[PDB]
Amino acid sequence: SEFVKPFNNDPFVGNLSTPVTTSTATKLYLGNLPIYRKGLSPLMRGLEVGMAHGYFLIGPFYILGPLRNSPNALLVGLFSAYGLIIILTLALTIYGLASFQDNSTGSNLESSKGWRSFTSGFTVGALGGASVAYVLLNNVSFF
Amino acid sequence: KVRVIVDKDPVATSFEKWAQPGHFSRTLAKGPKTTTWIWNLHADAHDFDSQTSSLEDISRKIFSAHFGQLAIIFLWVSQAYFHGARFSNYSAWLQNPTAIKPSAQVVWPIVGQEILNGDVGGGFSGVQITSGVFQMWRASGITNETELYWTAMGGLVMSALMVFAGWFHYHKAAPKLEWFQNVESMMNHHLAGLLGLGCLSWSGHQIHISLPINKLLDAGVAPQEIPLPHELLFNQDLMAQLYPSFKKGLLPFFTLNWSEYSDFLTFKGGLNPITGSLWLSDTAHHHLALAVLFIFAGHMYRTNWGIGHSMKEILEAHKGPLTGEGHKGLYEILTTSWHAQLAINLAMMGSLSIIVAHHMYAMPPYPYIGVDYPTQLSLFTHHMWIGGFCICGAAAHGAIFMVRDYSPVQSYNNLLDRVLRHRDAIISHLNWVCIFLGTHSFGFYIHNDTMRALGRPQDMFSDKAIQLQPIFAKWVQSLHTLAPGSTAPNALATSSYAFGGDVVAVNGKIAMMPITLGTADFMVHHIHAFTIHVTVLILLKGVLFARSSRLIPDKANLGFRFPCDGPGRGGTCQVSAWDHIFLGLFWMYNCISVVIFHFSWKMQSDVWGTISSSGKISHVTGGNFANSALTINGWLRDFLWSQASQVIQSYGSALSAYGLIFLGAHFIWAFSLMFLFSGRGYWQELIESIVWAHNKLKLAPAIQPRALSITQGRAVGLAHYLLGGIGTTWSFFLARIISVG
Amino acid sequence: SHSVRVYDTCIGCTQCVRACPCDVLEMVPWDGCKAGQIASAPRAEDCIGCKRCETACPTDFLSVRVYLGSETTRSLGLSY
Amino acid sequence: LLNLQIPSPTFGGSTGGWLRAAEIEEKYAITWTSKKEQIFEMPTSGAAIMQKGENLLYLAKKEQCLALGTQLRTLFKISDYKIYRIFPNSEVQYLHPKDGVFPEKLNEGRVGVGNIGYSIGKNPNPVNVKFTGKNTF
Amino acid sequence: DVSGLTPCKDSAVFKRRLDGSVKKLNSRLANYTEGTPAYIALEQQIEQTKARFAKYGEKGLLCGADGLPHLIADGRLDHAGEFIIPGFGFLYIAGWIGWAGRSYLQFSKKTDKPNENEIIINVPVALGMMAGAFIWPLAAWKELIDGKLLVPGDEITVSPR
Amino acid sequence: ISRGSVVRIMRPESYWFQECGSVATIAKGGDRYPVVVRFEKVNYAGVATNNFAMDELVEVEAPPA
Amino acid sequence: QQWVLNPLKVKPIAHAIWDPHFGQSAIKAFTRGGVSYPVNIATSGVYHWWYTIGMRTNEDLYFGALGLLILST
Numbered sequence A: 001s002e003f004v005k006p007f008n009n010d011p012f013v014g015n016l017s018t019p020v021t022t023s024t025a026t027k028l029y030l031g032n033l034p035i036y037r038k039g040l041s042p043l044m045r046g047l048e049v050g051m052a053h054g055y056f057l058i059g060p061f062y063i064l065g066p067l068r069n070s071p072n073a074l075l076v077g078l079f080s081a082y083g084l085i086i087i088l089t090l091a092l093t094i095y096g097l098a099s100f101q102d103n104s105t106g107s108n109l110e111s112s113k114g115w116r117s118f119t120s121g122f123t124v125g126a127l128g129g130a131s132v133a134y135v136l137l138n139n140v141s142f143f
Numbered sequence B: 001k002v003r004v005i006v007d008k009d010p011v012a013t014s015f016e017k018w019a020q021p022g023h024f025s026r027t028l029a030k031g032p033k034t035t036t037w038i039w040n041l042h043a044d045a046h047d048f049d050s051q052t053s054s055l056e057d058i059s060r061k062i063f064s065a066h067f068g069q070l071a072i073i074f075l076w077v078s079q080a081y082f083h084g085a086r087f088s089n090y091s092a093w094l095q096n097p098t099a100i101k102p103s104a105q106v107v108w109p110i111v112g113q114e115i116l117n118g119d120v121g122g123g124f125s126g127v128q129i130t131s132g133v134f135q136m137w138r139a140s141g142i143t144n145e146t147e148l149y150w151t152a153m154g155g156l157v158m159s160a161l162m163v164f165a166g167w168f169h170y171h172k173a174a175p176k177l178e179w180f181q182n183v184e185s186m187m188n189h190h191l192a193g194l195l196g197l198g199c200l201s202w203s204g205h206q207i208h209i210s211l212p213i214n215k216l217l218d219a220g221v222a223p224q225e226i227p228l229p230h231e232l233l234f235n236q237d238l239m240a241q242l243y244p245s246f247k248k249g250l251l252p253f254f255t256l257n258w259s260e261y262s263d264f265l266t267f268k269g270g271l272n273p274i275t276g277s278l279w280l281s282d283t284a285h286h287h288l289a290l291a292v293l294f295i296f297a298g299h300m301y302r303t304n305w306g307i308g309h310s311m312k313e314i315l316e317a318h319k320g321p322l323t324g325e326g327h328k329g330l331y332e333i334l335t336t337s338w339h340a341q342l343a344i345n346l347a348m349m350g351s352l353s354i355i356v357a358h359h360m361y362a363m364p365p366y367p368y369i370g371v372d373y374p375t376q377l378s379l380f381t382h383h384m385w386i387g388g389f390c391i392c393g394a395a396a397h398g399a400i401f402m403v404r405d406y407s408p409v410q411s412y413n414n415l416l417d418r419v420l421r422h423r424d425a426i427i428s429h430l431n432w433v434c435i436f437l438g439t440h441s442f443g444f445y446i447h448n449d450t451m452r453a454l455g456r457p458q459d460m461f462s463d464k465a466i467q468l469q470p471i472f473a474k475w476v477q478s479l480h481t482l483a484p485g486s487t488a489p490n491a492l493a494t495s496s497y498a499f500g501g502d503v504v505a506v507n508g509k510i511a512m513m514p515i516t517l518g519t520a521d522f523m524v525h526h527i528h529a530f531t532i533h534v535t536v537l538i539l540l541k542g543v544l545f546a547r548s549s550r551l552i553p554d555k556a557n558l559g560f561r562f563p564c565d566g567p568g569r570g571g572t573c574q575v576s577a578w579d580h581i582f583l584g585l586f587w588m589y590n591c592i593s594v595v596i597f598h599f600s601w602k603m604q605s606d607v608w609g610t611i612s613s614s615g616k617i618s619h620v621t622g623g624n625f626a627n628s629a630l631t632i633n634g635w636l637r638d639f640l641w642s643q644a645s646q647v648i649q650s651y652g653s654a655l656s657a658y659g660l661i662f663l664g665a666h667f668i669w670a671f672s673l674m675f676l677f678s679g680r681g682y683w684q685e686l687i688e689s690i691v692w693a694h695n696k697l698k699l700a701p702a703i704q705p706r707a708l709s710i711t712q713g714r715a716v717g718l719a720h721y722l723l724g725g726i727g728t729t730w731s732f733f734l735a736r737i738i739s740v741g
Numbered sequence C: 001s002h003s004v005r006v007y008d009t010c011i012g013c014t015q016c017v018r019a020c021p022c023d024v025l026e027m028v029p030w031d032g033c034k035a036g037q038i039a040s041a042p043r044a045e046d047c048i049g050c051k052r053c054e055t056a057c058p059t060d061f062l063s064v065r066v067y068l069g070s071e072t073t074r075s076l077g078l079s080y
Numbered sequence D: 001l002l003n004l005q006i007p008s009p010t011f012g013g014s015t016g017g018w019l020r021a022a023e024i025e026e027k028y029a030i031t032w033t034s035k036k037e038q039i040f041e042m043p044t045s046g047a048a049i050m051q052k053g054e055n056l057l058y059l060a061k062k063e064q065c066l067a068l069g070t071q072l073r074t075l076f077k078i079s080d081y082k083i084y085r086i087f088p089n090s091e092v093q094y095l096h097p098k099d100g101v102f103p104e105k106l107n108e109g110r111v112g113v114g115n116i117g118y119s120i121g122k123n124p125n126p127v128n129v130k131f132t133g134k135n136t137f
Numbered sequence E: 001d002v003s004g005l006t007p008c009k010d011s012a013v014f015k016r017r018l019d020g021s022v023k024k025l026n027s028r029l030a031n032y033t034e035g036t037p038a039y040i041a042l043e044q045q046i047e048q049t050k051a052r053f054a055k056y057g058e059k060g061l062l063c064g065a066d067g068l069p070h071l072i073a074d075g076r077l078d079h080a081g082e083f084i085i086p087g088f089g090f091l092y093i094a095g096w097i098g099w100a101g102r103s104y105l106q107f108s109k110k111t112d113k114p115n116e117n118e119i120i121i122n123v124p125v126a127l128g129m130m131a132g133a134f135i136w137p138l139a140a141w142k143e144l145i146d147g148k149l150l151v152p153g154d155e156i157t158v159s160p161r
Numbered sequence F: 001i002s003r004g005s006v007v008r009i010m011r012p013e014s015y016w017f018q019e020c021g022s023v024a025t026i027a028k029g030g031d032r033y034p035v036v037v038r039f040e041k042v043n044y045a046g047v048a049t050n051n052f053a054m055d056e057l058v059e060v061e062a063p064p065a
Numbered sequence G: 001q002q003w004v005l006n007p008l009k010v011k012p013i014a015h016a017i018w019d020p021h022f023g024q025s026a027i028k029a030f031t032r033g034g035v036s037y038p039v040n041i042a043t044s045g046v047y048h049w050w051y052t053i054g055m056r057t058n059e060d061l062y063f064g065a066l067g068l069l070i071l072s073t
């Protein structure tokens, strides 16, 4: 009872159709993640990715930062998250500039306009997510 | 049917092929034209599979070569026993083991080297030994030198017998491949016959000769008044006076009243308070139980009678959905190829040597070996090094099997084929594991160094700033400490005192003590894991990509060891599985060096030392591991720089030999870098200039000199590197431990 | 791509073409050699530069010679 | 040129196949004929079964194709192998047995390329070709 | 006297070194009893140490401020035994070795199988060459005069310049 | 030069440049390098023979009689 | 200027340290040379060279730096 078969019935492609690669759970989770979800605009993809990453980026800096044992621990963590997000979106912009040099299609992550929209969504979402995480950690007594 | 079939007089006994050096190899049989012929002779000396094509002849050669190796090993055991008999202070040490330093080597006075005959006590001058053979013989019950002399003579007789057997089984009566391929009968005889009867005979020896002599010695009887073993063997009255259960005879054995032998067959555990070692009654019970286990195990496989298993069917029955045909074909592979068997056996031998190292220090088996700190360190380090070497040999011979004896016809769709078909995924995932593990583990050390240098101890990964506690190791230690009451009710004490319990001490020195784990232990263990993982990455990549790769689709055609495939494709340097082994030997060297350094520092800081009457525990280095092992600076300062004093300050004393070997090992390690960094083209051009200089005086040799091959240069560099490193650590550890302990 | 050249010291042994793993070399008729053939490199763009031709060449110095030069995907032999 | 519908060898798949570059820069194909169905070793890691009659295989390198051709020639004595380069435009270029016979056999239709009229050690020095676009060969 | 050094006979530091070595052995001597092999061996050690120091004093070696012998190698015959006499001895022995090797190579090449003659030495004639190399300085001069020591210059390969 | 003779090589790029070698065969007609000189000193590749032109060889010892 | 008065005791200063990774202990340890901030002790002999050729005040060094800047321009 074989469970590892050729990828898309192609023995000569460098891949295997394992349970990890091809199972229904993997397909569902991957295809429903924002980067692969159907119908989402590049702005919406970038926005979702941005809030998801900016929400959790604050935590390492807040807990394990140099000023963890200081009254300004959370503020310093938020500023660190903002700086890291600035670096991340600068990386995104230069990546778009290097990769999608000539393009006129748009509405596609592999085009200049689409990648710019994705980066804009990522920046706004990450800033908002870091701010929301700051608010939650300030009001941690609620939970 | 399993039967004996041999060929009579398959080879003639003559010196003509002694005179003809390269007789074995087709290419070398012609004669020398360059100095590379000389190197190729030694390189291809024992490559029987390349020399011939008959598996029968290869098996016969291997069998008689094993006989020669056994002869050498018997000569080595003879040297140990004879030097103990003749050139040693074993009698004085037996009379007073704690005070007398064991020594069994004496140097002649020629160039002032007689200073090496240091003061070892007992009115004897010689070189202190660290092999533990004295404690071994004390456990065995040898109390006089005539016994050592006679067992040495017996070992010489056995070595001569092994040489004769090796001659006989190649030149007079050589077996057949059908005889060799009886793996089921071989396993039956090695389980029940070799291991089972070996354990049974050793248990009998212990029960009859070792328990009485050792018990009397621990009581206080000096060796002169000890009854001789031949007296103890049959004198049941004396054995009953010592162990009362012996008066009941063998009826409590034949009837199943085995509890009657509880006195001399115990389950006490722990360490004997007198000798600070394992109970010999426990050892005898252990070996007897193992003899029963192995004799039971050895009746599994089929032979001339109907009963029994077959490994072919056992393998072929084990197949799953995610493995296709499963283990089909592996029986044929392991019956036809010697290299696959060599790989598996070397891997297990090396891992077993490492396990031996880990067990012997924690549970000192021989009397007065725990207090003999040089012996413990020496044995642990030695067996760790042997284990690493054997594991890399396992990888190398697996690669050799892949290159030579692999064939898809027999392995279509079995586990070997399925592993080759996703080697890329395997190696990429192990690569990620290596990067993650190394980054985190070494970045802990680098972060700690940076914080200490910046004057921020509160930001360290220390036991009091940011704790990385080994919760699972501590939990396992707690379980093993509570085991003798709850989960091992018949055991009175723990298996080892390292997990916890009392502090066993003989005289002042501490034999064993609980080993506490903390942040430094967490860091160094994850460093061990990272090093092992990178070594496995290199070796496994070499084995998997032995056939071919994305860079060279026809790597198998070139061979097992070949220099390269030219500067094309950007450079195909060290693409061979041989070169992968060459790179992995550096990495196991790094791994084992870090392991032995961890062992040495941890034991000198936290176990070894002296305990006073009031209970004050004073360690060799003073428990500095827990706070100084957190940084590479602390490793450099408090371990290397601090403990190199006993080596560098050794001149003019008995350890001056250790100082000289320290410097010489450093020299050889540095010398190796010439071969490791340089290349053959430079040396060939330099040799051309020198050959011109010789031709000018009309003495250029007929055998034209050549620079060493690329593979040979790599091998020479690796060999010198390993020799220099291991010698440096050898001299350093021996000088330090002999001086302080 | 690398530059493959063949000099008139060739002796038509056809061993360079056999050692060739990329079909870069082929025998063509010639007058100078007694075997009536000479190695030639009409497909130098497929050359990778492993110099198996040079290794297999039995002349005192190499009739077939490869000069490494501009790198390409084919010359680097990248499957990706 | 090439049928693109020949049955391929039976193979269970591998990770040594083409990865995102053969489908965008160039792929390679090798087609041969076998007298019996039989097991062979792929240039990529694994064991495949070449079918009875015609067989077609895909690869990522001319080196891989030539290695498989050599394997077929010196193990199964199949010398009917022919190799093609397939571009993303689906242009097919028949490459290895260009004249219909292997390079080792001599044919009169081949013209010398890269043949020099003097011995190897008579090339000009680098100083002669300094500040010029030519080379010393 | 040369370079501010003094003879080791009138060298207080040299005498102090001798007494220190003697006192170190005699101390180590306390562990062992009279008449034992180790005791007599240590007595030999002390006697050899004293003999070495006396011989070094008598030989006229110069002892520096550190109290150790210093060898003068400039050509002065007052200290010929340090370098000049051992130097000539080594030169004679080394030329003997080189001449034996060269003459054996000259023989072995003329043989039908020189390659096998190099790795399997014809000992009966090799011993002859080792013996005959005792007179190498005259033999070397004779071969040089006869033009048989040096191979001419354009009969030896040389690479492309 | 001639069959059975000993000739010194003068090709600059040869491993046996300015070394003697025994002539084994001279090819007539074509064969830009017709002489076939055989040596007892193997080169780096391992071959002990090579083809040479007339002008690349210098006569040093005529064949036997 | 302080080093000029007592060359054999005052340690010359190369430049100030600005490092937000330093701890309080690091700042205290690197505060040396008779100044109130962390510094590096020069090991190039530039102080000795300038004192020998005749520089006596920070103004002379500053004007030399300006001249060298104009020369580079």
Ligand code: CLA
Residues within 6 Å of the ligand: A057, A060, A061, A064, A065, A066, A067, B439, B440, B441, B442, B443, B444, B446, B447, B450, B458, B459, B460, B466, G021
């Ligand atoms: C790799 C080892 C290592 C580790 C574990 C740490 C850890 C730390 N360092 Mg650093 N450090 C290191 C190496 C390391 N260091 C080295 C090599 C240096 C020398 C240059 C330094 C120098 C240094 C300084 C100078 C300082 C630190 C500090 C710190 C702390 C906070 C750093 C921070 O803000 O991180 C931010 C980290 C992140 C934003 C992300 C980390 C990665 C995330 C958690 C991974 C999650 C993966 C996830 C499971 C993937 C799958 C998810 C999927 C299933 C959904 C922290 C204790 C600071 C401190 O105060 O120390 C107490 C500080 O001042 N370090």
Ligand code: CLA
Residues within 6 Å of the ligand: B042, B043, B044, B045, B046, B047, B048, B342, B346, B389, B390, B392, B393, B394, B396, B400, B560, B561, B578, B581, B719, B723
């Ligand atoms: C059971 C043990 C075992 C056996 C039977 C073999 C058998 C073989 N190995 Mg080996 N091998 C082993 C263990 C073993 N190996 C281990 C532990 C390693 C890991 C290091 C290797 C790694 C290895 C490689 C990488 C290769 C082999 C190869 C071979 C084959 C040829 C070896 C030969 O002719 O050497 C003849 C003996 C010599 C050339 C002398 C070696 C001298 C060593 C390098 C130095 C010794 C130093 C000395 C102990 C200390 C000097 C001190 C100083 C102060 C003077 C042969 C089938 C080769 C092959 O082609 O296999 C098919 C090959 O390439 N083996």
Ligand code: CLA
Residues within 6 Å of the ligand: B431, B432, B434, B435, B436, B437, B438, B439, B442, B443, B444, B446, B534, B537, B538, B583, B586, B587
């Ligand atoms: C100190 C010397 C040194 C160093 C630093 C390395 C480093 C490495 N070797 Mg090794 N190697 C060495 C000596 C060394 N080697 C020698 C002498 C040899 C010859 C025998 C080899 C031969 C060799 C082979 C053959 C292989 C390696 C591999 C590796 C990698 C292991 C994976 C890993 O943990 O990466 C992580 C990096 C490190 C452990 C280095 C220090 C990391 C610190 C903590 C910083 C990390 C954080 C951050 C990213 C960077 C810091 C900030 C920066 C921006 C300023 C790694 C890059 C293996 C590999 O590539 O596996 C994937 C491998 O196959 N090495």
Ligand SMILES: CC1=C(/C=C/C(C)=C/C=C/C(C)=C/C=C/C=C(C)/C=C/C=C(C)/C=C/C2=C(C)CCCC2(C)C)C(C)(C)CCC1
Residues within 6 Å of the ligand: A051, A052, A053, A055, A056, A124, A125, A127, A128, A129, A131, A132
């Ligand atoms: C799958 C899975 C997993 C994982 C998980 C994860 C990965 C998670 C994550 C999570 C997260 C990571 C989350 C996040 C969240 C976020 C949020 C919730 C956010 C929000 C935001 C907001 C709301 C914003 C706002 C704004 C904007 C947008 C802009 C402007 C400003 C403002 C502020 C207005 C595990 C391992 C468990 C296992 C099982 C499975």
Ligand SMILES: CC1=C(/C=C/C(C)=C/C=C/C(C)=C\C=C\C=C(C)\C=C\C=C(C)\C=C\C2=C(C)CCCC2(C)C)C(C)(C)CCC1
Residues within 6 Å of the ligand: B697, E073, E074, E075, E083, E084, E094, E095, E096, E097, E098, E099, E102, E136, E140
């Ligand atoms: C006196 C003296 C001195 C001086 C010295 C000198 C100055 C020297 C010089 C020297 C020199 C300047 C030399 C030269 C040489 C040259 C040449 C050119 C050589 C040659 C040789 C040869 C050729 C050899 C050969 C041989 C023989 C004869 C034998 C053996 C073998 C052989 C073959 C090797 C001093 C001060 C130190 C001090 C001490 C004393």
Ligand SMILES: CC1=C(C/C=C(\C)CCC[C@H](C)CCC[C@H](C)CCCC(C)C)C(=O)c2ccccc2C1=O
Residues within 6 Å of the ligand: B674, B675, B676, B678, B679, B680, B683, B684, B687, B706, B707, B708, B709, B710, B712, B713, B714
């Ligand atoms: C130093 C070095 C050499 C030079 C070494 C050579 C030519 C071989 C040296 C072997 C010697 C001859 C072994 C014996 C040394 C004895 C001390 C010589 C005296 C005994 C004679 C009778 C032979 C290489 O050829 C080389 C090649 C490839 C990578 C690295 C290197 C490399 O590092």
Ligand code: SF4
Residues within 6 Å of the ligand: B563, B564, B565, B566, B567, B571, B572, B573, B574, B679, B710
């Ligand atoms: S140095 Fe050796 S391994 Fe490296 S490219 Fe050259 S021949 Fe190949």
Ligand code: SF4
Residues within 6 Å of the ligand: C006, C009, C010, C011, C012, C013, C014, C015, C016, C017, C039, C056, C057, C058, C059, C063, C064
């Ligand atoms: S010399 Fe080289 S190019 Fe000429 S025929 Fe021989 S292998 Fe081919």
